[model samples]
Target: KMSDLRTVTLYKGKAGFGFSLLGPAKAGPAEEGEPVGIFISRILPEGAAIESGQVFEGDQILSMNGQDLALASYRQAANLVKHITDGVMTLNLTANPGMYDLYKQ
Candidate 1:
C-alpha cells in the first residue's frame, strides 16, 4: 500500500547544496556528519520506503525524483515529497558514508 512519509524541512538550497531542519518526530539525535536514515514516521498511516545510505543529517538533499530544489523553504521542499503517491523518490545526498561504520562494529 502507498503511504505518506514525514520528512524534515529544508530551509535553503544553493545549486547542489542545502540544509534541512529536522522535525521533532525524529527518534534520535543526529550529529553533523552522521548518516541519516529515512523512514515513515509512525504518525503516518502508510509506510515510506527508505533506501540504505539515502541521506545524511547535515548533508544536502540535492533532488527529488530527478528534480533539483534550489533555495526552497522548509515547507516547499517537503511538499515535493508529500505530493508523490507511488514510485521511489530519488535523492542526491553528499556525506561521509563512513560515519555509519561504527554501528556495525
Candidate 2:
C-alpha cells in the first residue's frame, strides 16, 4: 500500500519551482525538481513522494498539512499518488540531463 506521507504547505512559485515548509518534518536538502521524500507516522517504509519546488536547503517547515508545523502532532503528509487517482498532477519541472555544461552551470 502507501507509505509515510507528510503534508507540506506550498507557498509561492517561480521559475517552475515553489517553496514548501514541511511542518515538524525533518528532511534533507532537496534540489529543484527533485523527488521529495515524505515521512508518515505509523506507516511502513516511513516516507512518501513529493516534487521539490523552489525551497532550498535549511528551510524549516512552518506548518504540517494545514496545522502548525512546529506543533503539529502528526508529522506526515498524505500520499500524492493515493490522493490523486484521476487526472494528472501537473507539475512544471526542469532537470540537468547532463547534456550542455554551459547552461547548467
Candidate 3:
C-alpha cells in the first residue's frame, strides 16, 4: 500500500546523513540508468536518519531538499543526497510496500 507523504529532517553527521539510496539502476532491471524510483536502502546506526527514529528501511524517497526524485536517475539521486553534508535536510517519504523489493534484483 502506498502511504501518505511524511516529512522529516535529517541532521547530517560526520559521515553524512547515514543512509544510502537504492534506485532502479542499482536495485532492479531498469535499463542502465533509468529514473524509476529511489528507496531508502540502508540506515546506518550513526547518522541522523537512524537517530531521527522515523526514517526506516525500504521507505520510498519521493523528494529531498525540495528536489523531486520520483523521476531522477540513480546518479542524480545519489549525487543529491551526497552533496548535502553537515546540515538538516528535508525529505518526503512513504511506505511503498513491495516497491522496494523490486530493487533487490
- Clashing residue pairs, candidate 2? 5-77, 6-76, 6-77, 7-77, 18-54, 21-61, 23-63, 23-69, 63-69
Q: Which has the greatest TM-score?
A: 3
Give per-residue CA lDDT, model 1, range 6-45, as digits (tens).
2333322222222233222233445665444431222212
- By the lDDT metric, which is better: model 2 or model 3? 3
lDDT, candidate 3, 1-98, per-residue tens:
43477899987757668888777544334565333688888888788888887788888998899987776767888887768755868999987757
**10 residues in a row with least lDDT, candidate 3:** 26-35
Instruction: Point out the higher-scoring one by TM-score: 1 or 3.
Output: 3
Badly placed stretches (over 4 Å) of model 2 are 1-53, 73-105
What lDDT would candidate 3 get against the real structure? 0.77
Q: In model 3, where do residues sit more than 4 Å from their true spots? A: 1-4, 26-35
Ranking by lDDT: 3, 1, 2
* Cα lDDT tens digits for candidate 2, 1-105: 432232333322322222222222334454564334321212112112124332222333333334333323223433332253332333222222231122123
